[PDB]
Ligand binder design. Structure first.
Ligand SMILES: [Ba+2]
Lengths: 269, 243
């Protein structure tokens, strides 16, 4: 198997690190590949893709709250946009370090919609997620004005050998008098205090809403998000119950229909 | 190459358990020299083949593999046919047949369907074997499910001969996948491994198959409860901690 294949496999594994376990997986993959220069060349894109896929939140010196690393904030050449603070910053994907904040702008047509939606969203997020973070972008994409709202919330407990993260991405395409809504909600949990167990879940959402002013419509946007995220969370818990009490039992009973453990002398006779 | 092997095993504890066979294959391509070490230390999802002579399914794993063929526990031959595939002694084959019939009944009682297979092999001072059970749900239900049990037992038969030491290493892999309007797609997957060791009287009142049966039953019941607690308790608690 060629060096090109090996580093393809290395890059893939790195992209599949569970939330909160990047360092562990990277060091494993580094020592197995055992060719740092090849790793740097064939797999650099993977470090960046992981953080953007994960919506990694980052602290920036001099600014309150945290900003998400997403594709929507990628400015090229290692820099990312903080659209709330109106700055760009260099991001080190390996160390997860923000540096060199510089003043920036991008879109301004949607400045007021982005600002209305961010204010409404930030309150929503801080109300519903223990340590949630959000970043809201406004862009023209393939012809159309789009508000994109990203939400992240994680709980890492490496000393109890578990990690979890929630991500949701909500795209509002503004074609007054309506906005089309497309979203994907994601959850990932890894528990390995015993042996490897993971929950991976996603849900796609499609809706539409009536646009008015920036303020009223932001409110409308948040109501849609709040309801769908509540709906999804309730449904996840309902499904666990069905699984725990029905499907699981259908794989293996606790005990045989005899309602006691096995009479082995009967089996063998 | 111990550092590399440690990294390989650790990595397997972290990659998504839904992709085991693929990940192990990729991991060996990544470190070819660690192949035998990894095939020997990482459990793989069980696969089904058909024994057409007896009309019964049987289970494939590395324990009944010789080259690119697999041995049926029903007919005691390899598919494809081999020149000299590894086979048990006559003595051990009789025990293998009895264990397959015992575990079919055990499977019927606890699982009410699925497939079982028992493969035994001779050792210098006793024998060893694997008891395999695979049950899948009804895949017309919005909630799909697979359970694989892989129970390795190592028996040191002590001269004499009315005593033996049993070591049992058991892995259960459990996967559940649902696709619902309300919860979108949920995929819950993983595995738990446990080990035990015990000395037992071997007699007509307590033959090897009864001793092994009780160890497997005790262990699998315990693993089922642990899975119940982790899958539907602990991961659910984590999700609800996120929002
Ligand atoms: Ba082994």
């Amino acid at each position: 198997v060629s060096d090109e294949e090996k580093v393809r496999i290395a890059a893939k594994f790195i992209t599949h690190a569970p939330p909160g376990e990047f360092n562990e997986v990277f060091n494993d993959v580094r020592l197995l590949l055992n060719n740092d220069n090849l790793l740097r060349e064939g797999a650099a894109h993977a470090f960046a893709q992981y953080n953007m896929d994960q919506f990694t939140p980052v602290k920036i010196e001099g600014y309150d709250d945290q900003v998400l690393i997403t594709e929507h904030g990628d400015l090229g050449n290692g820099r990312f946009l903080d659209p709330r603070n109106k700055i760009s910053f260099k991001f080190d994907h390996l160390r997860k370090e923000a540096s060199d904040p510089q003043p920036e702008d991008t879109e301004s047509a949607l400045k007021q919609w982005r600002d209305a939606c961010d204010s409404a969203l930030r309150a929503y997020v801080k109300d519903h997620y223990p340590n949630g973070f959000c970043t809201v972008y406004g862009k023209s994409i393939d012809g159309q004005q789009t508000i994109i709202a990203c939400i992240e919330s994680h709980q890492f407990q490496p000393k109890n050998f578990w990690n979890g993260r929630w991500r949701s991405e909500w795209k509002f395409t503004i074609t007054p008098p309506t906005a089309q809504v497309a979203a994907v909600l994601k959850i990932q949990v890894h528990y390995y205090e015993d042996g490897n167990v993971q929950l991976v879940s996603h849900k796609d959402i499609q809706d539409s809403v009536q646009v008015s002013s920036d303020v009223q419509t932001a409110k409308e946007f948040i109501k849609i998000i709040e309801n769908a995220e509540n709906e999804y969370q309730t449904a996840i818990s309902e499904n666990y119950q069905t699984m725990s009490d029905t499907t699981f039992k259908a794989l293996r009973r606790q005990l045989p229909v005899t309602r006691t453990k096995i009479d082995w002398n009967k089996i063998l006779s | 190459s111990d550092q590399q092997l440690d990294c390989a095993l650790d990595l397997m504890r972290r990659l998504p358990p839904q992709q085991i066979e693929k990940n192990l294959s990729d991991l060996i391509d990544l470190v070819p020299s660690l192949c035998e070490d990894l095939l020997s230390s990482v459990d793989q999802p069980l696969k089904i083949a058909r024994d057409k002579v007896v009309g019964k399914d049987y289970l494939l794993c590395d324990y009944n593999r010789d080259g690119d063929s697999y041995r049926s526990p029903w007919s005691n031959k390899y598919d494809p046919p081999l020149e000299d595939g590894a086979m048990p002694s006559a003595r051990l084959r009789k025990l293998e047949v009895e264990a397959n019939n015992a575990f079919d009944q055990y499977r019927d009682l606890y699982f009410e369907g699925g497939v079982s297979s028992v493969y035994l092999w001779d050792l210098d001072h006793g024998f060893a074997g694997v008891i395999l059970i695979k049950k899948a749900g009804d895949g017309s239900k919005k909630i799909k499910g697979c359970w694989d049990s892989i129970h390795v037992v190592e028996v040191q038969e002590k001269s004499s001969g009315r005593t033996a030491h049993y070591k049992l290493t058991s892995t259960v892999m459990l996967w559940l996948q649902t696709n619902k309007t309300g919860s979108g797609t949920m995929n819950l997957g993983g595995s738990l491994t446990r080990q035990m060791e015990k000395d037992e009287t071997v007699s007509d009142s307590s033959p090897h198959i009864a001793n092994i049966g009780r160890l497997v039953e005790d262990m699998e019941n315990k693993i089922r409860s642990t899975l119940n607690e982790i899958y539907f308790g602990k991961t659910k608690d984590i999700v609800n901690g996120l929002r």
